[PDB]
Amino acid sequence: EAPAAVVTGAAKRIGRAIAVKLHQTGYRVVIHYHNSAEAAVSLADELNKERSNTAVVCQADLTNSNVLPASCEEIINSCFRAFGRCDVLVNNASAFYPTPLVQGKTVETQVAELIGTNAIAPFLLTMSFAQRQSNLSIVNLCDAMVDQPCMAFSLYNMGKHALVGLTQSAALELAPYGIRVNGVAPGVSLLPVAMGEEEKDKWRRKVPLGRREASAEQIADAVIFLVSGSAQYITGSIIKVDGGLSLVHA
Amino acid sequence: EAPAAVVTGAAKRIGRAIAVKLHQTGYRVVIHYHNSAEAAVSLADELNKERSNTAVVCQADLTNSNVLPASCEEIINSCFRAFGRCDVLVNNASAFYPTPLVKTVETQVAELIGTNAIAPFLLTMSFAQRQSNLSIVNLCDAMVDQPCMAFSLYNMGKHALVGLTQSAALELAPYGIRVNGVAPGVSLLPVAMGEEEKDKWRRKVPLGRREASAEQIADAVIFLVSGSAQYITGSIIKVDGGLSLVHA
Amino acid sequence: EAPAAVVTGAAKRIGRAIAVKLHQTGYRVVIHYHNSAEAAVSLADELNKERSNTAVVCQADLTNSNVLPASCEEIINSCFRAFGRCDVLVNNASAFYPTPLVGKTVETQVAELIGTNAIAPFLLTMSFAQRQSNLSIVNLCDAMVDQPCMAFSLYNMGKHALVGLTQSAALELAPYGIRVNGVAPGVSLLPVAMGEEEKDKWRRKVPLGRREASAEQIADAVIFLVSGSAQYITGSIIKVDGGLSLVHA
Amino acid sequence: EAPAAVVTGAAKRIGRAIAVKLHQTGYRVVIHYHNSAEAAVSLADELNKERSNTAVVCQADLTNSNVLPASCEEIINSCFRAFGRCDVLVNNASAFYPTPLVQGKTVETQVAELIGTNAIAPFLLTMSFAQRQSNLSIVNLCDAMVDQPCMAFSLYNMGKHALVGLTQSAALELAPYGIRVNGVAPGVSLLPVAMGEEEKDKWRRKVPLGRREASAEQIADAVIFLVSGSAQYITGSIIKVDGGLSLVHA
């Protein structure tokens, strides 16, 4: 039968593009979402209209807490319940906002959301994916600009660096099980919905290759590569998909 | 007056060497401890005998919890109380143990991410908020990119500490606060580890087939806080005898 | 028309597998070689049997010298003379042998290891861009550049220089729509003459499957990078190393 | 007796500051120079006035050619001839100018100067230093911006990347002989003499720590540390001295 993938934060934007392209490649997909229930169910409907019984949704907060391990366990379980197997995990869900060091959320809430979604939830999902176990792999959505960070984003940056560490540590530890672990690191892709055009164009103008952001499809293309049989010897690699942005000095 | 430094996990091993060497350089010091009160006080006694009223201790658990922010606030405050200023923060305290992918997990998170990364972040915030040659030094790990098998959470925390080092260097540079790291390889081996397993690591090191002493680590800390490093920020100095250059 | 690609050192091993896969993808190919004329011609004949007039050979030494710029210009020109265009350059050719710090002269070692691994790539990149749609260059890098073999300093220098060229050229050619990327093998095809027992010491160190990459696995990453699936990727270097570079001493 | 150090390109700017500070620390110095004969001899005069017989000059072109190995051997030999020992090599000399990929020196000459001075000469000097062999060490002047390069500086960038490789490879290979090999990587320090003032201030304003370039002395300070007894377990390390410049995104 068809392989199955979990994509976290898959209702919109890049995570939707990944779920769609996995689906088009022939995967069955768990569309995880947190708040975006209408968007999630709408996507699942679309996919299921293309091939029936091939998409389900799964709701979970990926904020760190004492129940996050259970929630991550349940996301993986939802793939096995729906499809009988889980071949691919894409850790795409992410919180992203400033946490200035010199200063309504409390700091322990910021830590829970930015470190939880970007790093701890990927770790617990990886553990559950490996434990619940062909071409198995995990793809972590990283950030090409992790070493040239946005001013005042220390906790987000910490979380994305931790995710690089997970990608490496998990690639090493899971290789004996045949599970590959790799990352895709966008530079500027879909800009934040809240961002003004003028601010969007400032970012666009910085990109060497075309002076434009990555499309969601372009990000998903690299994910599709890493899960594919064309990447069978690739583990612990993080592919930047950034149009050269990370090479540009100040 | 004399400048003042906070050193976390300063009662034993690497943090003790750092505290001693800072003290010998003329800093007044806050010796932070969690469980090692006797050791902390013994060090303070040794330092105060050399120079009166130049060393104090500060207890705090650095596990992540609802109260870690307040604890980190207190460590920094205790420096300003004792000495009227705080010039240097050395984020040295660390938890280290395996967390296989295949203690509850959330306690492991609280220790290996809390003590290794979140507490540095909160201490950095408190240090900067409460503000010369000001600087922060984070104790990183030279083997971050070639990690020990089954140490994912530990490795995650040390990568996050790299991220903090860079992000805080950028954000605090406007305030004249430098932020740097020192990345040991094999130093004083964990007490638990066997001597045979220790020998195996020793032989792998290009420079002299031996571990770093704690004082070698402290030497790099001293450089980074000194006036000889006044343009250095966002740098992580490996002190590993070349171990990280060695392939499998 | 079908696009065209230059692959250096394409007679054997990895460069051969790259030229084959590019050809199977629909590229016309220039098969560059230095000493292996029989192998280069054999490959070109095999490809031309598959599709006529799609494969040519081009002989050149890529050792650093006064004449290397002209040689590199002529490699690129050969693709335009054969095929009327040059879409892809794969810098694959490489010299690889120890150069201890403490029977060729040292300046010959420099010329061969720095010329093949770095200088020739640079000169080919210049000739490629000057002669100019999905244009791209792929440089064969080395995943173990930061954990080098003992006594391989010149080889290691050349491969680090190649990383620099990949980044610098990606930034500089991005306005011309030319992407520049790398593929960094760990242990792939080992020497044929290397004892199986020595080959096994290497294979045992690879986390993923305790084996070396095939040439085809390396070529697969090249194919991705030149493909329309990599249209936003430039300045990136993809390790294809089975996790070898993650393993501590 | 006092230890001895070779500093390449030591007549002016950062190399001069390194030679001065090593001398101030107790070292006897070989002041290598290519064209700057007046300033070389003037510096050696100045140091010898401070302590007699503690400074010599040594002229050599570090452009790549079939005679560069002999020129490198001669630089090391000059230290032994003057001082009977050679404890420290500082690879500081450097050519630096644009070499655009797309179009009055020939390209052959641009390769010879930029790869010879920045990389090949360091390698051959390292070879000679090791072959002729307390607290021995080599310090290579690298570049903090090598992964965010100046546009059109490909050959310079290639040379500096090669120098990172040399720093690592030589640190591994020479560690058994008790020779440590490390790097110091400036960001913007003393700006080119050729450069206008508006352009200098543009670069200054990018530096997070102080919005100013490094002094030559601040670069030398890091060199002094790496050769010192306080760096005895440090090898294969490159210390950026860049005021945060390499952390700043486009």
Ligand SMILES: NC(=O)C1=CN([C@@H]2O[C@H](COP(=O)(O)OP(=O)(O)OC[C@H]3O[C@@H](n4cnc5c(N)ncnc54)[C@H](OP(=O)(O)O)[C@@H]3O)[C@@H](O)[C@H]2O)C=CC1
């Ligand atoms: N866009 C860009 O330019 C870049 C993106 N990336 C990375 O690529 C990935 C995709 O980016 P993008 O599509 O912009 O991501 P978004 O910012 O759109 O976030 C994706 C999803 O994350 C989910 N999420 C947020 N917080 C939580 C939480 N507490 N619990 C569970 N889910 C949560 C949301 O699900 P819901 O809507 O259901 O609440 C959201 O739709 C991310 O990992 C991101 O960091 C990296 C660099 C640049």
Ligand SMILES: NC(=O)C1=CN([C@@H]2O[C@H](COP(=O)(O)OP(=O)(O)OC[C@H]3O[C@@H](n4cnc5c(N)ncnc54)[C@H](OP(=O)(O)O)[C@@H]3O)[C@@H](O)[C@H]2O)C=CC1
């Ligand atoms: N040792 C080596 O070879 C290596 C060192 N490092 C880094 O070097 C630094 C120092 O290492 P080392 O001296 O061996 O450290 P240890 O592992 O011996 O621990 C240092 C101190 O940290 C404190 N600490 C640990 N957990 C907590 C906690 N939850 N709350 C509060 N304090 C805590 C302890 O203080 P107390 O005793 O008072 O409870 C402890 O003595 C660390 O940051 C480490 O990661 C990096 C890699 C290798």
Ligand SMILES: NC(=O)C1=CN([C@@H]2O[C@H](COP(=O)(O)OP(=O)(O)OC[C@H]3O[C@@H](n4cnc5c(N)ncnc54)[C@H](OP(=O)(O)O)[C@@H]3O)[C@@H](O)[C@H]2O)C=CC1
């Ligand atoms: N195999 C592996 O495990 C690894 C490979 N790589 C890289 O992958 C690429 C392909 O590897 P592999 O197939 O093993 O390479 P080889 O060592 O087999 O060399 C490829 C070709 O390089 C050509 N070459 C050598 N010297 C010169 C020269 N002076 N002038 C012109 N051409 C020359 C030769 O052509 P001819 O036969 O015609 O003389 C040779 O067949 C290389 O860049 C290599 O560094 C990196 C890491 C590991």
Ligand SMILES: NC(=O)C1=CN([C@@H]2O[C@H](COP(=O)(O)OP(=O)(O)OC[C@H]3O[C@@H](n4cnc5c(N)ncnc54)[C@H](OP(=O)(O)O)[C@@H]3O)[C@@H](O)[C@H]2O)C=CC1
């Ligand atoms: N200054 C800065 O902002 C930065 C500098 N650096 C690095 O730090 C080091 C010192 O920088 P800086 O003082 O600006 O260097 P300079 O550009 O001033 O060059 C140093 C010396 O190198 C010598 N040199 C040049 N070409 C040759 C050659 N063919 N043969 C022999 N010697 C030659 C010259 O000697 P002579 O005058 O005798 O002919 C020159 O005085 C260099 O390696 C540089 O790459 C790194 C990044 C930033």
Ligand SMILES: Nc1nc2ccc(C(=O)NCCc3ccc(Br)cc3)cc2s1
């Ligand atoms: N979950 C998400 N993670 C990231 C990471 C990076 C980016 C990104 O680069 N966005 C454009 C640059 C940007 C966006 C917002 C601010 Br405020 C500053 C810069 C956007 C996102 S969305």
